[PDB]
Amino acid sequence: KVVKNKAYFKRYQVKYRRRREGKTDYRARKALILQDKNKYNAQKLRFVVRKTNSQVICQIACAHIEGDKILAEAKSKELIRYGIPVGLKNYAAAYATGLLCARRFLKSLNLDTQFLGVEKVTRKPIKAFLDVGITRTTTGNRVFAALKGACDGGLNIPHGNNRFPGSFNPEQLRKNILGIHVAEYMKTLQEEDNDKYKTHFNDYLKNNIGADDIEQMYLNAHEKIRQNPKKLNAKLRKKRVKEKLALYVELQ
Amino acid sequence: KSRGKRSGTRYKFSKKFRKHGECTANKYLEKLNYGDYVDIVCDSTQQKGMPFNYYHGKTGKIFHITKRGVGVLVNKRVKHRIEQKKVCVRIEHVRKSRCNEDFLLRKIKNAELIKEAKLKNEHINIKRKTEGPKPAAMIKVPPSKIITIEPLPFY
Amino acid sequence: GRRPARCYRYCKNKPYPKSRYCRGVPDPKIRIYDMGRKKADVNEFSGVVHLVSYEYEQISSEALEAARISANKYMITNCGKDNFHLRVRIHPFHVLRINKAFGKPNGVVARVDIGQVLLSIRTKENFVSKACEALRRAKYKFPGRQKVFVSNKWGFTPFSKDEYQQYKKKGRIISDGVSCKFIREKGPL
Amino acid sequence: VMREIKVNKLVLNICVGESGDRLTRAARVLEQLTEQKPIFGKCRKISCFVTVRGKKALEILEKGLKRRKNFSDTGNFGFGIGMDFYVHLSRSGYRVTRRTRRRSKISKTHKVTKEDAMKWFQTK
RNA sequence: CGCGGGGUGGAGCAGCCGGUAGCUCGUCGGGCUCAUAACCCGAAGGUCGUCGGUUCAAAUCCGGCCCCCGCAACCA
RNA sequence: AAGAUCUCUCAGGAUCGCUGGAGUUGAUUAAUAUAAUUUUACCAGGUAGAGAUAAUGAUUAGAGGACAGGGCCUUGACCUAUUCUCAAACUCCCAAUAGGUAAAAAGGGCGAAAUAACUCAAUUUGUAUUUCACUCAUAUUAAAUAAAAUAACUCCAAGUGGGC
RNA sequence: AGAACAGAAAUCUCUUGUAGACUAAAAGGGGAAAAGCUUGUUUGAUUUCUAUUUUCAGAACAAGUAGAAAACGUGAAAGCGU
RNA sequence: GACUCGUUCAUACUACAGUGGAUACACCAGAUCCCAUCAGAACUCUGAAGUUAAGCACUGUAAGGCUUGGCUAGUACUGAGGUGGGAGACCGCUCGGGAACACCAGGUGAUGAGUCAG
User: Which residues are Mg(2+)-binding (chain C) (predicted)?
Assistant: First the structure.
């Protein structure tokens, strides 16, 4: 038999709309949602990180029956307000975006005065849990960078440590969140071929950013963030259908 | 003859059509209290905590809640006596009951009515009274626009 | 020989056709079915006559075969082989069982209730009475009492003779070969 | 216009069928010929194969090059001498099928077809 | 008609203890001898009752039909 | 009562059921408890039915199309839309009947204050409990109807277990 | 629908594929970002205890379910594992 | 105008077309480092040169499906009653309850929370 048939269409059961779009796992999502039933009136916070091919999006979401209520929100293109104009997909940007969302959340609570988080890298803060982010997990992924930034920001997101370098290494993480690895690759690329360097990092040059400057700019930005958070109708179709059938016969 | 746990459930524990696979998370999020009435209605996907045949579609009070379990006191007829039996069921199988929700709505409307009646100083009768009393009534159809009917003949 | 069939005048017990469970069935006597001008279209004859159940007759495979063969011969002798179509409308499927614990398989019946056509003949208007007589002869080889009917359908399609002419006249009915589609104003041409 | 014709994959494949010395030698030869480390069959290992990409695939085709119904409907093709391989063409934007965030199907009037492949074969 | 054992070369047994089916006689080709056997050398030949099933693999294990032999019909 | 469970058990026994006595509790306030009953809400269903153009197993015909058989032609299979009759151990859909929860005072409303070693970032952030409040029909009863306490409950025991 | 040996079946590729596969074994249920298949890390197939559910006397045994007290195993965490 | 988290889980599906790209999404470019393989295809990381050609959104189609409604049909079926009928098989009547397929007509979604450029 041919593949596509009326019985097959009638029988076929659709998958959920967001899963069709590609966004939601559901199996992870329900576990992320569901509180212990006897522990009623407490709703598990999701720290949402979705990595778009242009900038990363960090949200605090709280699940409710008519859908998730969004408490805090940060996008990388807010970092522009904090003087960061390029590198929006970057590990360093993700850390900052995470730090910014946490700071905005803390400001909203007013809990910022109680918990500032730790200024600069090597009673209790609110607990929240990292979203699925639909990514195959890796050391140094941007979701982990955002979680680290959010934690350093102030959140108590519980986590393992081997999705950062040194499976722990603090220096490699520090270089990653600074953007030192980008800087070294820029210098290396300039050494290799300067046309190839310019053709690659076009935006950074327009902005007037050298490799040296990136770590300093990120440090200034972190301090700044901390300081300052058609359709037709049936009658019409009948008329049109009649005319096209007649017309095609009359023409041909 | 044999009498194992799922004995005689081929039709009963079948899926309904177009309802196959795991069901929405937002079913599980539903909030339950001690002393709620709750229906026991079972999706067939999740196999742990599945109650016995008799308790399907039954209703009873929640007396205990656990991590993903709910204790429900359900009545069972055992020959010459009904007794209350402690059916442990899952978040998956609990449905919030609706008889209580009619009582709640009824109470709410009655309370507003009671407030109004007290404010106006005139008695009311709450009672969900009889069906059967009909007042006198009029037909205004034109006298030759009425439908004339007769029996139906054969093939 | 076999059981005397008088007992199976009554309809009783659950339906027992062949199954994955059963195995070992004896074959039908009637595997022949229909006769006449086999591939003839509905437009190529005009009437239909019908032999109709009226006892709650089980109908043996042999009875169905015997009635049909007799009918067919009477039709061929009288009205000629190519001038009708003789249709065996009923299909036996129900397997009896017997002993000399569960019975061992015995012959096939159909367990047919009242008001169902068993046999039918399609022909020209000229030979419908002849066809009715062939069915009357056939009835003498069917258990109990039956009834006979001749329809004002065009035949082998549900439409009336008058309906057939009207639809045909305005081209609304197309034959797919006996079977006919009534055009419902859809799809490509 | 925006559209393109482009190689996706070339595959070297040999089901040797003796499952030892010739197969082991063959896989090493295939690795020597094109750098990529081989991948291997099962048994009822009976076969050795590897994927070849882009510029490198074109080089293998170029040595290969020197029936017109050899092409598939999707414009893919192969041949042997002796030693043998097969080529699959797919234009850019094929990624949508694989792309984990938003996996989906390419348009039918954007799929490669026979005609574009045949023109490409004449072109080269 | 109720129980249990058995169907592999032309014939009769092995394998039949799951993959690779053996032996003898018989058949066939060549020798030896007035002549013919006996005798010697060498080969060919199995579709594994039949219909369906398991298993990575069935002639074998798993059923239902078809034949073949063995039991059984007693107190009434 | 001739149902039931276990039994070297099947002509038996034990223990359950149904029965009686005796007591106590409840009752006397036309009621509340209560009920082989309905009502109005509210569910849970897949048997009867119905289906083969929804799946499985069947199953009779032709028609329209691009691998095989017969002797360039024809027959098939095969694809595609149809067509006849179908199933205890098949199911798209699907009854009646039977079943369950519901209809407020030892309680429920909305408030305050207390208690924790539970609970969250968070000693009111909830949870639950407790003390104080304010107040819900019943002066015909938050749907009926009821020789509704002749109801409960405890004790002690019988007969019975071949039924039709 | 294509590709040496290579054919009806061998492997490889592209397209199409609501499960028509598979789920140790029966038959029936359930199962597609799995409950199938591949891979990684492992031994919770752990110790102690209830409330129970099934059979039903609502005894036993046996099988379960929902928890609790431990010690851990796994995962990025939520979690999940008796 | 655009996007994120969602919700209901086909009015949301499927199939073939057409229409749209300020900001955005995506397609696209690269592989030093984290990473991942047979393969930078995917995944990971880093880019921003181009583009609506696709993805995606919107719409169309005698579309198919799904979905409501009518009509099938008070037909089929069925509870209770009857010293009702029928040789039986079965069939009426009294009190009641009451379908399904086909067919025909309509429809082809709505929505919570947050964000960016109006």
Answer: 13
